[PDB]
Amino acid sequence: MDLNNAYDHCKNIIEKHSKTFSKAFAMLPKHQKRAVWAIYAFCRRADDIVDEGENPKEELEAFAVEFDLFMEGRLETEDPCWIALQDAFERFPLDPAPFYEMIVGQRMDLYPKTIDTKDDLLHYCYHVASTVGLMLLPVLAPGKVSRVKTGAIELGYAMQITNILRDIGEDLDNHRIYIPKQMMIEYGYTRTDLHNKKVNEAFIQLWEDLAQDAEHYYRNALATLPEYPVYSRTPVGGAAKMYRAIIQTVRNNDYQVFGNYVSDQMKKQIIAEMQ
Amino acid sequence: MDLNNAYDHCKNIIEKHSKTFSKAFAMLPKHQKRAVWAIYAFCRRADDIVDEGENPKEELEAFAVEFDLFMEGRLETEDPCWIALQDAFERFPLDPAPFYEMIVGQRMDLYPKTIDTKDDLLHYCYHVASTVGLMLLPVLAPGKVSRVKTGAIELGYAMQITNILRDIGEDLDNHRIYIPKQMMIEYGYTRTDLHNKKVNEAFIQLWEDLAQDAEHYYRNALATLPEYPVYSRTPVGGAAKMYRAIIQTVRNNDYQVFGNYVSDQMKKQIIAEMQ
Ligand SMILES: [Mg+2]
Ligand SMILES: [Mg+2]
Ligand SMILES: [Mg+2]
Ligand SMILES: [Mg+2]
Numbered sequence: 001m002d003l004n005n006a007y008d009h010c011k012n013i014i015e016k017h018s019k020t021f022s023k024a025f026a027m028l029p030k031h032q033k034r035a036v037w038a039i040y041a042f043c044r045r046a047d048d049i050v051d052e053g054e055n056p057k058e059e060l061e062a063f064a065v066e067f068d069l070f071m072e073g074r075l076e077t078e079d080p081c082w083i084a085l086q087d088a089f090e091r092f093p094l095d096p097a098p099f100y101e102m103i104v105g106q107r108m109d110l111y112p113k114t115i116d117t118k119d120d121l122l123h124y125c126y127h128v129a130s131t132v133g134l135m136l137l138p139v140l141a142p143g144k145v146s147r148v149k150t151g152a153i154e155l156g157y158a159m160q161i162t163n164i165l166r167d168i169g170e171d172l173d174n175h176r177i178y179i180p181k182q183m184m185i186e187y188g189y190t191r192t193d194l195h196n197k198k199v200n201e202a203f204i205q206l207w208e209d210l211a212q213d214a215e216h217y218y219r220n221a222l223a224t225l226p227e228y229p230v231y232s233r234t235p236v237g238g239a240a241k242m243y244r245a246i247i248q249t250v251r252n253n254d255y256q257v258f259g260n261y262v263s264d265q266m267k268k269q270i271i272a273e274m275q
Numbered sequence: 276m277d278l279n280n281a282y283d284h285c286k287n288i289i290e291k292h293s294k295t296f297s298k299a300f301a302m303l304p305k306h307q308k309r310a311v312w313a314i315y316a317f318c319r320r321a322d323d324i325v326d327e328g329e330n331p332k333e334e335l336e337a338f339a340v341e342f343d344l345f346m347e348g349r350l351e352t353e354d355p356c357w358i359a360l361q362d363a364f365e366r367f368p369l370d371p372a373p374f375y376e377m378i379v380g381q382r383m384d385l386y387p388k389t390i391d392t393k394d395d396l397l398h399y400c401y402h403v404a405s406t407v408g409l410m411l412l413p414v415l416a417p418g419k420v421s422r423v424k425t426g427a428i429e430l431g432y433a434m435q436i437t438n439i440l441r442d443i444g445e446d447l448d449n450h451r452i453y454i455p456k457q458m459m460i461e462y463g464y465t466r467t468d469l470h471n472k473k474v475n476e477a478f479i480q481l482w483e484d485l486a487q488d489a490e491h492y493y494r495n496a497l498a499t500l501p502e503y504p505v506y507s508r509t510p511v512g513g514a515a516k517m518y519r520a521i522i523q524t525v526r527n528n529d530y531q532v533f534g535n536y537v538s539d540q541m542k543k544q545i546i547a548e549m550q
């Protein structure tokens with residue numbers, strides 16, 4: 001298909017999978033918005049290989065090999081996701097380094113793994129979420145990447161910790177645990193408690209500890225918003241606040257994360273306030 | 276109750292929970308057999324606290340505190356398991372050190388944990404299984420403990436690896452994985468493969484690698500049997516060969532460990548051959 005229809009393919013992907021990020025980045029100007037769609041499609045395919053694919057090691061390495069060919073300028077394909085990403089790399093000075101780092105992060109979910117410390121958690125969050133922020137920065141803040149980089153990495157930490165805090169039960173059912181073992185020990189929340197899906201006072205202490213780290217990272221990220229160009233401030237600030245609002249959503253539902261999303265109306269409220 | 280009935284309480288525990296070890300150690304002379312029953316009851320209660328209890332951290336620490344009081348000679352109780360173990364410590368020169376080490380091993384299952392390497396696996400096997408061998412040695416080989424110690428530790432490795440190899444699916448359903456991550460990577464058996472309960476050629480390669488380590492440890496342990504007193508040779512050799520036979524049982528059932536036990540008749544055959 002042509003470039004317009006390849007980008008529209010990516011528009012469908014982001015709209016189907018993230019009401020938050022599709023709504024936030026729809027507010028960007030045309031070519032920046034389309035580039036975000038193409039970058040999102042790259043991230044979605046990598047994560048879905050590892051989290052939903054039936055042969056994730058072989059499929060992720062094949063994806064990595066395709067990205068190598070893409071970066072050499074030699075990938076000949078009819079895949080709309082690569083057609084769109086080719087244009088985005090041509091149109092904006094996208095840096096391949098965080099794209100490779102995403103793949104490093106996805107490799108971390110191929111085999112059994114225990115998060116021991118908060119440092120272990122941030123290492124994982126850096127490679128699977130902070131890298132997304134870094135992929136986007138040349139589109140969102142041309143010429144100002146080094147100025148906003150730290151806030152973008154920390155926004156990744158904030159969003160990934162939020163994701164983890166929302167998904168404790170979903171991940172448990174999928175035989176994954178991202179809560180640090182050392183905080184489980186600190187607060188006296190055992191593996192048997194977690195397996196029993198217990199929402200007790202120790203769980204809440206641990207959950208709030210992580211949530212407060214996320215809130216600190218969101219605050220640090222939002223402090224950098226004046227350094228973005230004006231046309232990126234509502235998209236980035238809106239994405240940040242809409243995703244942060246998952247935390248208070250869970251609190252308002254009494255920390256029940258073993259069975260949470262921000263309502264459509266609340267997303268509109270946050271976007272209006274940014275605007 | 277009196278001492279005879281306290282030991283009979285422990286006899287019921289071992290008979291209910293292990294046809295293999297009850298049958299093997301029933302062949303010991305009277306007082307050694309009864310001491311093994313009491314030691315088994317100690318190990319069973321510790322493991323069941325951690326693997327079946329609803330508050331395993333609090334309950335295991337309370338068990339540890341009771342054992343501290345027991346070792347000080349100050350535990351006043353009507354618990355038949357402690358009455359029997361008091362007599363066994365009085366009657367044979369039992370060493371408390373491996374009993375404490377068991378509790379260290381049980382603590383390892385209180386919180387999320389990933390076995391990375393074979394060294395990690397042997398560290399775990401030492402504390403939960405090798406320690407049982409060490410608790411028993413003053414009963415099984417009085418005056419000859421240092422001579423047979425290494426074989427007893429390695430018999431622990433052999434039996435625990437066998438247990439793990441039989442229980443991969445049972446442990447997975449309980450959100451535990453004891454297969455080393457580095458062997459999963461070596462053989463290309465992913466977390467998604469394991470979650471999918473796939474019995475493929477990579478699984479079999481990994482399973483056989485561990486089984487061959489266990490077989491080596493069984494061989495080393497059995498090589499020490501002539502150093503045991505005559506009355507312990509059939510109990511120890513019988514326990515070893517009956518538990519080893521789980522490995523070939525699984526092989527004969529095509530490695531299907533996601534849904535295996537040695538038949539009663541095969542246990543009798545092994546005991547007769549020892550005799
Ligand atoms: Mg993922
Ligand atoms: Mg995912
Ligand atoms: Mg998630
Ligand atoms: Mg156990």
Ligand SMILES: [Mg+2]
Binds near residue numbers: 322
């Ligand atoms: Mg057990």
Ligand SMILES: [Mg+2]
Binds near residue numbers: 439
């Ligand atoms: Mg077991």
